[PDB]
Amino acid sequence: ASAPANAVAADDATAIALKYNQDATKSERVAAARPGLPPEEQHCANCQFMQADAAGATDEWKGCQLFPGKLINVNGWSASWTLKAG
Ligand code: SF4
């Protein structure tokens, strides 16, 4: 439940550029509708680019390639998601 001290801020420069919503339920994913899988089934957990092996990862909060020294919620989402197809 509780967010980690280093939660990626939704309003971080990176989160802005990426449109990282932190919550997939509220996420613009619905509109952004990335290819691969329907928006409802998209979140960081399924993201090709996610560093699961983040230095400090935990189940709810994994690392994103572009967001070092913070963690993104696995049930969050951003624009450059891409369904894990590799
Ligand atoms: S690139 Fe992937 S892991 Fe990183 S914030 Fe976007 S959806 Fe999440």
PDB file of N, CA and C and ligand atoms in Angstrom:
ATOM      1  N   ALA A   1       0.837  -1.210   0.000  1.00  0.00           N
ATOM      2  CA  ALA A   1       0.000   0.000   0.000  1.00  0.00           C
ATOM      3  C   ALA A   1       0.870   1.257   0.000  1.00  0.00           C
ATOM      4  N   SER A   2       1.436   1.595   1.163  1.00  0.00           N
ATOM      5  CA  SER A   2       2.188   2.813   1.404  1.00  0.00           C
ATOM      6  C   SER A   2       3.255   3.062   0.336  1.00  0.00           C
ATOM      7  N   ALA A   3       3.291   4.278  -0.210  1.00  0.00           N
ATOM      8  CA  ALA A   3       4.290   4.644  -1.199  1.00  0.00           C
ATOM      9  C   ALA A   3       5.685   4.686  -0.555  1.00  0.00           C
ATOM     10  N   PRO A   4       6.740   4.372  -1.318  1.00  0.00           N
ATOM     11  CA  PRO A   4       8.109   4.357  -0.847  1.00  0.00           C
ATOM     12  C   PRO A   4       8.623   5.791  -0.792  1.00  0.00           C
ATOM     13  N   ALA A   5       9.608   6.048   0.071  1.00  0.00           N
ATOM     14  CA  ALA A   5      10.208   7.370   0.220  1.00  0.00           C
ATOM     15  C   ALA A   5      10.652   7.949  -1.128  1.00  0.00           C
ATOM     16  N   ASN A   6      11.118   7.085  -2.037  1.00  0.00           N
ATOM     17  CA  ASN A   6      11.568   7.476  -3.369  1.00  0.00           C
ATOM     18  C   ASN A   6      10.519   7.241  -4.466  1.00  0.00           C
ATOM     19  N   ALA A   7       9.223   7.139  -4.166  1.00  0.00           N
ATOM     20  CA  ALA A   7       8.203   7.114  -5.212  1.00  0.00           C
ATOM     21  C   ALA A   7       8.499   8.147  -6.307  1.00  0.00           C
ATOM     22  N   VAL A   8       8.546   7.718  -7.573  1.00  0.00           N
ATOM     23  CA  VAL A   8       8.617   8.654  -8.683  1.00  0.00           C
ATOM     24  C   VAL A   8       7.431   9.615  -8.563  1.00  0.00           C
ATOM     25  N   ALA A   9       7.706  10.919  -8.564  1.00  0.00           N
ATOM     26  CA  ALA A   9       6.671  11.933  -8.514  1.00  0.00           C
ATOM     27  C   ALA A   9       5.987  12.025  -9.878  1.00  0.00           C
ATOM     28  N   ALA A  10       4.651  11.994  -9.902  1.00  0.00           N
ATOM     29  CA  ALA A  10       3.869  12.135 -11.129  1.00  0.00           C
ATOM     30  C   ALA A  10       4.213  13.423 -11.891  1.00  0.00           C
ATOM     31  N   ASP A  11       4.681  14.449 -11.171  1.00  0.00           N
ATOM     32  CA  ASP A  11       5.054  15.745 -11.723  1.00  0.00           C
ATOM     33  C   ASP A  11       6.583  15.899 -11.825  1.00  0.00           C
ATOM     34  N   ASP A  12       7.354  14.799 -11.810  1.00  0.00           N
ATOM     35  CA  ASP A  12       8.787  14.880 -12.073  1.00  0.00           C
ATOM     36  C   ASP A  12       8.955  15.200 -13.557  1.00  0.00           C
ATOM     37  N   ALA A  13      10.062  15.826 -13.954  1.00  0.00           N
ATOM     38  CA  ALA A  13      10.317  16.180 -15.346  1.00  0.00           C
ATOM     39  C   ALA A  13      10.096  14.952 -16.230  1.00  0.00           C
ATOM     40  N   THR A  14      10.677  13.832 -15.806  1.00  0.00           N
ATOM     41  CA  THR A  14      10.527  12.562 -16.473  1.00  0.00           C
ATOM     42  C   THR A  14       9.073  12.100 -16.483  1.00  0.00           C
ATOM     43  N   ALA A  15       8.360  12.209 -15.356  1.00  0.00           N
ATOM     44  CA  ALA A  15       6.982  11.761 -15.317  1.00  0.00           C
ATOM     45  C   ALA A  15       6.103  12.630 -16.213  1.00  0.00           C
ATOM     46  N   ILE A  16       6.457  13.910 -16.356  1.00  0.00           N
ATOM     47  CA  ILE A  16       5.738  14.838 -17.214  1.00  0.00           C
ATOM     48  C   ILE A  16       5.938  14.369 -18.648  1.00  0.00           C
ATOM     49  N   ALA A  17       7.202  14.318 -19.080  1.00  0.00           N
ATOM     50  CA  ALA A  17       7.553  13.931 -20.438  1.00  0.00           C
ATOM     51  C   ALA A  17       6.933  12.583 -20.806  1.00  0.00           C
ATOM     52  N   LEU A  18       6.980  11.626 -19.880  1.00  0.00           N
ATOM     53  CA  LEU A  18       6.472  10.286 -20.110  1.00  0.00           C
ATOM     54  C   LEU A  18       4.946  10.209 -19.961  1.00  0.00           C
ATOM     55  N   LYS A  19       4.271  11.215 -19.388  1.00  0.00           N
ATOM     56  CA  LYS A  19       2.916  11.101 -18.892  1.00  0.00           C
ATOM     57  C   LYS A  19       2.750   9.854 -18.011  1.00  0.00           C
ATOM     58  N   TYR A  20       3.571   9.761 -16.963  1.00  0.00           N
ATOM     59  CA  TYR A  20       3.502   8.690 -15.977  1.00  0.00           C
ATOM     60  C   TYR A  20       2.442   9.029 -14.926  1.00  0.00           C
ATOM     61  N   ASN A  21       1.334   8.278 -14.873  1.00  0.00           N
ATOM     62  CA  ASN A  21       0.219   8.641 -13.989  1.00  0.00           C
ATOM     63  C   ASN A  21       0.353   8.088 -12.568  1.00  0.00           C
ATOM     64  N   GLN A  22       1.235   7.107 -12.351  1.00  0.00           N
ATOM     65  CA  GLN A  22       1.399   6.386 -11.086  1.00  0.00           C
ATOM     66  C   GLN A  22       0.233   5.443 -10.767  1.00  0.00           C
ATOM     67  N   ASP A  23      -1.015   5.875 -10.972  1.00  0.00           N
ATOM     68  CA  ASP A  23      -2.177   4.996 -10.961  1.00  0.00           C
ATOM     69  C   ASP A  23      -2.643   4.709 -12.392  1.00  0.00           C
ATOM     70  N   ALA A  24      -2.592   3.441 -12.801  1.00  0.00           N
ATOM     71  CA  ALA A  24      -3.125   3.002 -14.075  1.00  0.00           C
ATOM     72  C   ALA A  24      -4.647   3.174 -14.164  1.00  0.00           C
ATOM     73  N   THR A  25      -5.404   3.121 -13.062  1.00  0.00           N
ATOM     74  CA  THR A  25      -6.856   3.229 -13.189  1.00  0.00           C
ATOM     75  C   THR A  25      -7.238   4.609 -13.737  1.00  0.00           C
ATOM     76  N   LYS A  26      -6.647   5.669 -13.181  1.00  0.00           N
ATOM     77  CA  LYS A  26      -6.848   7.040 -13.627  1.00  0.00           C
ATOM     78  C   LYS A  26      -6.067   7.370 -14.906  1.00  0.00           C
ATOM     79  N   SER A  27      -4.922   6.714 -15.144  1.00  0.00           N
ATOM     80  CA  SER A  27      -4.067   6.939 -16.309  1.00  0.00           C
ATOM     81  C   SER A  27      -4.796   7.261 -17.618  1.00  0.00           C
ATOM     82  N   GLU A  28      -4.200   8.184 -18.378  1.00  0.00           N
ATOM     83  CA  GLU A  28      -4.526   8.486 -19.760  1.00  0.00           C
ATOM     84  C   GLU A  28      -4.365   7.274 -20.690  1.00  0.00           C
ATOM     85  N   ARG A  29      -3.826   6.142 -20.206  1.00  0.00           N
ATOM     86  CA  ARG A  29      -3.744   4.891 -20.952  1.00  0.00           C
ATOM     87  C   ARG A  29      -4.997   4.639 -21.792  1.00  0.00           C
ATOM     88  N   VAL A  30      -6.176   4.803 -21.191  1.00  0.00           N
ATOM     89  CA  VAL A  30      -7.478   4.667 -21.836  1.00  0.00           C
ATOM     90  C   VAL A  30      -7.500   5.366 -23.203  1.00  0.00           C
ATOM     91  N   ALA A  31      -7.026   6.613 -23.260  1.00  0.00           N
ATOM     92  CA  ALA A  31      -6.991   7.396 -24.486  1.00  0.00           C
ATOM     93  C   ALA A  31      -5.778   7.015 -25.332  1.00  0.00           C
ATOM     94  N   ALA A  32      -4.621   6.899 -24.682  1.00  0.00           N
ATOM     95  CA  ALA A  32      -3.344   6.674 -25.340  1.00  0.00           C
ATOM     96  C   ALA A  32      -3.249   5.305 -26.025  1.00  0.00           C
ATOM     97  N   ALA A  33      -4.052   4.338 -25.559  1.00  0.00           N
ATOM     98  CA  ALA A  33      -4.294   3.005 -26.101  1.00  0.00           C
ATOM     99  C   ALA A  33      -3.107   2.464 -26.901  1.00  0.00           C
ATOM    100  N   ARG A  34      -2.013   2.141 -26.204  1.00  0.00           N
ATOM    101  CA  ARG A  34      -0.814   1.625 -26.856  1.00  0.00           C
ATOM    102  C   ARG A  34      -1.136   0.298 -27.546  1.00  0.00           C
ATOM    103  N   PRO A  35      -0.418  -0.044 -28.625  1.00  0.00           N
ATOM    104  CA  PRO A  35      -0.588  -1.314 -29.303  1.00  0.00           C
ATOM    105  C   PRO A  35      -0.102  -2.455 -28.404  1.00  0.00           C
ATOM    106  N   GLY A  36      -0.455  -3.688 -28.772  1.00  0.00           N
ATOM    107  CA  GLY A  36      -0.046  -4.890 -28.065  1.00  0.00           C
ATOM    108  C   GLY A  36      -1.216  -5.481 -27.287  1.00  0.00           C
ATOM    109  N   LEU A  37      -1.761  -4.726 -26.328  1.00  0.00           N
ATOM    110  CA  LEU A  37      -2.780  -5.197 -25.389  1.00  0.00           C
ATOM    111  C   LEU A  37      -3.702  -4.008 -25.109  1.00  0.00           C
ATOM    112  N   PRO A  38      -4.980  -4.211 -24.755  1.00  0.00           N
ATOM    113  CA  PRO A  38      -5.915  -3.110 -24.587  1.00  0.00           C
ATOM    114  C   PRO A  38      -5.513  -2.297 -23.351  1.00  0.00           C
ATOM    115  N   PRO A  39      -5.766  -0.976 -23.335  1.00  0.00           N
ATOM    116  CA  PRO A  39      -5.267  -0.067 -22.314  1.00  0.00           C
ATOM    117  C   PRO A  39      -5.506  -0.570 -20.890  1.00  0.00           C
ATOM    118  N   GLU A  40      -6.682  -1.134 -20.632  1.00  0.00           N
ATOM    119  CA  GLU A  40      -7.076  -1.676 -19.349  1.00  0.00           C
ATOM    120  C   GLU A  40      -6.057  -2.695 -18.821  1.00  0.00           C
ATOM    121  N   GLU A  41      -5.407  -3.456 -19.706  1.00  0.00           N
ATOM    122  CA  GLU A  41      -4.406  -4.449 -19.343  1.00  0.00           C
ATOM    123  C   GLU A  41      -2.978  -3.887 -19.380  1.00  0.00           C
ATOM    124  N   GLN A  42      -2.789  -2.571 -19.521  1.00  0.00           N
ATOM    125  CA  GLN A  42      -1.458  -1.978 -19.571  1.00  0.00           C
ATOM    126  C   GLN A  42      -1.096  -1.365 -18.226  1.00  0.00           C
ATOM    127  N   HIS A  43       0.140  -1.592 -17.784  1.00  0.00           N
ATOM    128  CA  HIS A  43       0.751  -0.935 -16.640  1.00  0.00           C
ATOM    129  C   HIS A  43       2.227  -1.326 -16.611  1.00  0.00           C
ATOM    130  N   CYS A  44       3.049  -0.572 -15.871  1.00  0.00           N
ATOM    131  CA  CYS A  44       4.501  -0.719 -15.754  1.00  0.00           C
ATOM    132  C   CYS A  44       4.894  -2.187 -15.543  1.00  0.00           C
ATOM    133  N   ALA A  45       4.135  -2.940 -14.737  1.00  0.00           N
ATOM    134  CA  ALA A  45       4.371  -4.372 -14.543  1.00  0.00           C
ATOM    135  C   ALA A  45       4.599  -5.145 -15.854  1.00  0.00           C
ATOM    136  N   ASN A  46       3.927  -4.733 -16.936  1.00  0.00           N
ATOM    137  CA  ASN A  46       3.938  -5.412 -18.232  1.00  0.00           C
ATOM    138  C   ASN A  46       4.864  -4.710 -19.232  1.00  0.00           C
ATOM    139  N   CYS A  47       5.613  -3.697 -18.793  1.00  0.00           N
ATOM    140  CA  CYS A  47       6.360  -2.807 -19.665  1.00  0.00           C
ATOM    141  C   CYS A  47       7.697  -3.430 -20.055  1.00  0.00           C
ATOM    142  N   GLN A  48       7.935  -3.585 -21.363  1.00  0.00           N
ATOM    143  CA  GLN A  48       9.184  -4.114 -21.896  1.00  0.00           C
ATOM    144  C   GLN A  48      10.399  -3.452 -21.228  1.00  0.00           C
ATOM    145  N   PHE A  49      10.348  -2.129 -21.049  1.00  0.00           N
ATOM    146  CA  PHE A  49      11.486  -1.333 -20.606  1.00  0.00           C
ATOM    147  C   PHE A  49      11.714  -1.348 -19.087  1.00  0.00           C
ATOM    148  N   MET A  50      10.852  -1.988 -18.286  1.00  0.00           N
ATOM    149  CA  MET A  50      10.956  -1.863 -16.835  1.00  0.00           C
ATOM    150  C   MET A  50      12.189  -2.601 -16.291  1.00  0.00           C
ATOM    151  N   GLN A  51      13.019  -1.928 -15.483  1.00  0.00           N
ATOM    152  CA  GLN A  51      14.046  -2.610 -14.706  1.00  0.00           C
ATOM    153  C   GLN A  51      13.390  -3.172 -13.447  1.00  0.00           C
ATOM    154  N   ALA A  52      12.881  -4.399 -13.559  1.00  0.00           N
ATOM    155  CA  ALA A  52      12.378  -5.124 -12.406  1.00  0.00           C
ATOM    156  C   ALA A  52      13.449  -5.217 -11.317  1.00  0.00           C
ATOM    157  N   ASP A  53      14.691  -5.495 -11.721  1.00  0.00           N
ATOM    158  CA  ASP A  53      15.843  -5.593 -10.836  1.00  0.00           C
ATOM    159  C   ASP A  53      16.389  -4.192 -10.533  1.00  0.00           C
ATOM    160  N   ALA A  54      15.538  -3.338  -9.963  1.00  0.00           N
ATOM    161  CA  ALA A  54      15.931  -1.998  -9.553  1.00  0.00           C
ATOM    162  C   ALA A  54      16.618  -2.054  -8.192  1.00  0.00           C
ATOM    163  N   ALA A  55      17.666  -1.248  -8.008  1.00  0.00           N
ATOM    164  CA  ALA A  55      18.370  -1.129  -6.740  1.00  0.00           C
ATOM    165  C   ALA A  55      17.452  -0.523  -5.674  1.00  0.00           C
ATOM    166  N   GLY A  56      16.646  -1.382  -5.050  1.00  0.00           N
ATOM    167  CA  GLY A  56      15.668  -1.041  -4.025  1.00  0.00           C
ATOM    168  C   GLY A  56      14.235  -1.428  -4.404  1.00  0.00           C
ATOM    169  N   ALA A  57      14.034  -2.199  -5.481  1.00  0.00           N
ATOM    170  CA  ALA A  57      12.703  -2.615  -5.901  1.00  0.00           C
ATOM    171  C   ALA A  57      11.954  -3.366  -4.793  1.00  0.00           C
ATOM    172  N   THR A  58      10.622  -3.309  -4.840  1.00  0.00           N
ATOM    173  CA  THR A  58       9.717  -4.105  -4.017  1.00  0.00           C
ATOM    174  C   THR A  58       8.462  -4.368  -4.849  1.00  0.00           C
ATOM    175  N   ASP A  59       7.642  -5.362  -4.503  1.00  0.00           N
ATOM    176  CA  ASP A  59       6.559  -5.864  -5.349  1.00  0.00           C
ATOM    177  C   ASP A  59       5.760  -4.749  -6.024  1.00  0.00           C
ATOM    178  N   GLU A  60       5.216  -3.836  -5.219  1.00  0.00           N
ATOM    179  CA  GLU A  60       4.411  -2.723  -5.687  1.00  0.00           C
ATOM    180  C   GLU A  60       5.211  -1.693  -6.497  1.00  0.00           C
ATOM    181  N   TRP A  61       6.528  -1.582  -6.286  1.00  0.00           N
ATOM    182  CA  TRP A  61       7.338  -0.487  -6.788  1.00  0.00           C
ATOM    183  C   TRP A  61       8.645  -1.004  -7.378  1.00  0.00           C
ATOM    184  N   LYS A  62       8.731  -0.983  -8.708  1.00  0.00           N
ATOM    185  CA  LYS A  62       9.876  -1.460  -9.475  1.00  0.00           C
ATOM    186  C   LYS A  62      10.540  -0.239 -10.115  1.00  0.00           C
ATOM    187  N   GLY A  63      11.628  -0.419 -10.866  1.00  0.00           N
ATOM    188  CA  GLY A  63      12.349   0.713 -11.433  1.00  0.00           C
ATOM    189  C   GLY A  63      12.067   0.810 -12.922  1.00  0.00           C
ATOM    190  N   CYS A  64      12.002   2.034 -13.433  1.00  0.00           N
ATOM    191  CA  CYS A  64      11.869   2.294 -14.851  1.00  0.00           C
ATOM    192  C   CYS A  64      13.231   2.751 -15.361  1.00  0.00           C
ATOM    193  N   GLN A  65      13.618   2.298 -16.556  1.00  0.00           N
ATOM    194  CA  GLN A  65      14.898   2.606 -17.176  1.00  0.00           C
ATOM    195  C   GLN A  65      15.239   4.100 -17.079  1.00  0.00           C
ATOM    196  N   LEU A  66      14.269   4.976 -17.358  1.00  0.00           N
ATOM    197  CA  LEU A  66      14.500   6.417 -17.380  1.00  0.00           C
ATOM    198  C   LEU A  66      14.429   7.057 -15.988  1.00  0.00           C
ATOM    199  N   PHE A  67      14.051   6.315 -14.938  1.00  0.00           N
ATOM    200  CA  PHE A  67      13.809   6.879 -13.611  1.00  0.00           C
ATOM    201  C   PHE A  67      14.692   6.194 -12.560  1.00  0.00           C
ATOM    202  N   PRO A  68      16.009   6.444 -12.568  1.00  0.00           N
ATOM    203  CA  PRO A  68      16.927   5.849 -11.614  1.00  0.00           C
ATOM    204  C   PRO A  68      16.789   6.532 -10.251  1.00  0.00           C
ATOM    205  N   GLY A  69      17.137   5.811  -9.181  1.00  0.00           N
ATOM    206  CA  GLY A  69      17.132   6.340  -7.821  1.00  0.00           C
ATOM    207  C   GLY A  69      15.738   6.740  -7.328  1.00  0.00           C
ATOM    208  N   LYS A  70      14.685   6.270  -8.002  1.00  0.00           N
ATOM    209  CA  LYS A  70      13.296   6.366  -7.585  1.00  0.00           C
ATOM    210  C   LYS A  70      12.647   5.069  -8.084  1.00  0.00           C
ATOM    211  N   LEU A  71      11.355   4.843  -7.823  1.00  0.00           N
ATOM    212  CA  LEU A  71      10.666   3.637  -8.282  1.00  0.00           C
ATOM    213  C   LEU A  71       9.312   4.049  -8.847  1.00  0.00           C
ATOM    214  N   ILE A  72       8.828   3.350  -9.878  1.00  0.00           N
ATOM    215  CA  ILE A  72       7.499   3.555 -10.433  1.00  0.00           C
ATOM    216  C   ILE A  72       6.568   2.448  -9.930  1.00  0.00           C
ATOM    217  N   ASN A  73       5.316   2.804  -9.637  1.00  0.00           N
ATOM    218  CA  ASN A  73       4.328   1.833  -9.192  1.00  0.00           C
ATOM    219  C   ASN A  73       4.062   0.842 -10.321  1.00  0.00           C
ATOM    220  N   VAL A  74       4.094  -0.465 -10.044  1.00  0.00           N
ATOM    221  CA  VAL A  74       3.899  -1.465 -11.091  1.00  0.00           C
ATOM    222  C   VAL A  74       2.493  -1.420 -11.688  1.00  0.00           C
ATOM    223  N   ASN A  75       1.526  -0.930 -10.906  1.00  0.00           N
ATOM    224  CA  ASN A  75       0.174  -0.639 -11.343  1.00  0.00           C
ATOM    225  C   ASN A  75       0.044   0.835 -11.748  1.00  0.00           C
ATOM    226  N   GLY A  76       1.161   1.506 -12.041  1.00  0.00           N
ATOM    227  CA  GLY A  76       1.204   2.766 -12.759  1.00  0.00           C
ATOM    228  C   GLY A  76       1.417   2.486 -14.239  1.00  0.00           C
ATOM    229  N   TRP A  77       1.600   3.533 -15.041  1.00  0.00           N
ATOM    230  CA  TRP A  77       1.675   3.425 -16.486  1.00  0.00           C
ATOM    231  C   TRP A  77       2.226   4.747 -17.008  1.00  0.00           C
ATOM    232  N   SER A  78       2.907   4.719 -18.162  1.00  0.00           N
ATOM    233  CA  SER A  78       3.291   5.906 -18.913  1.00  0.00           C
ATOM    234  C   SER A  78       3.157   5.679 -20.425  1.00  0.00           C
ATOM    235  N   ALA A  79       3.381   6.735 -21.212  1.00  0.00           N
ATOM    236  CA  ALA A  79       3.194   6.761 -22.655  1.00  0.00           C
ATOM    237  C   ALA A  79       4.040   5.709 -23.371  1.00  0.00           C
ATOM    238  N   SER A  80       5.354   5.702 -23.134  1.00  0.00           N
ATOM    239  CA  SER A  80       6.272   4.792 -23.800  1.00  0.00           C
ATOM    240  C   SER A  80       6.281   3.456 -23.063  1.00  0.00           C
ATOM    241  N   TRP A  81       5.106   2.846 -22.906  1.00  0.00           N
ATOM    242  CA  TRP A  81       4.962   1.599 -22.179  1.00  0.00           C
ATOM    243  C   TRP A  81       5.522   0.447 -23.021  1.00  0.00           C
ATOM    244  N   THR A  82       4.798   0.012 -24.054  1.00  0.00           N
ATOM    245  CA  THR A  82       5.166  -1.149 -24.861  1.00  0.00           C
ATOM    246  C   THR A  82       5.032  -2.441 -24.057  1.00  0.00           C
ATOM    247  N   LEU A  83       4.012  -3.224 -24.412  1.00  0.00           N
ATOM    248  CA  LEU A  83       3.820  -4.564 -23.897  1.00  0.00           C
ATOM    249  C   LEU A  83       5.130  -5.340 -24.040  1.00  0.00           C
ATOM    250  N   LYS A  84       5.605  -5.941 -22.949  1.00  0.00           N
ATOM    251  CA  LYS A  84       6.693  -6.894 -22.937  1.00  0.00           C
ATOM    252  C   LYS A  84       6.495  -7.921 -24.063  1.00  0.00           C
ATOM    253  N   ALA A  85       7.220  -7.737 -25.170  1.00  0.00           N
ATOM    254  CA  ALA A  85       7.228  -8.615 -26.336  1.00  0.00           C
ATOM    255  C   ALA A  85       8.666  -9.072 -26.593  1.00  0.00           C
ATOM    256  N   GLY A  86       9.385  -9.337 -25.504  1.00  0.00           N
ATOM    257  CA  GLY A  86      10.828  -9.347 -25.418  1.00  0.00           C
ATOM    258  C   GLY A  86      11.119  -8.569 -24.138  1.00  0.00           C
TER     259      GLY A  86
HETATM  260  S1  SF4 B   1       8.491   3.140 -19.529  1.00  0.00           S
HETATM  261 FE1  SF4 B   1       7.346   1.435 -18.761  1.00  0.00          FE
HETATM  262  S2  SF4 B   1       8.064   1.106 -16.707  1.00  0.00           S
HETATM  263 FE2  SF4 B   1       8.711   3.119 -17.352  1.00  0.00          FE
HETATM  264  S3  SF4 B   1       7.126   4.438 -16.562  1.00  0.00           S
HETATM  265 FE3  SF4 B   1       6.647   3.960 -18.660  1.00  0.00          FE
HETATM  266  S4  SF4 B   1       5.293   2.231 -18.555  1.00  0.00           S
HETATM  267 FE4  SF4 B   1       6.265   2.396 -16.601  1.00  0.00          FE
END
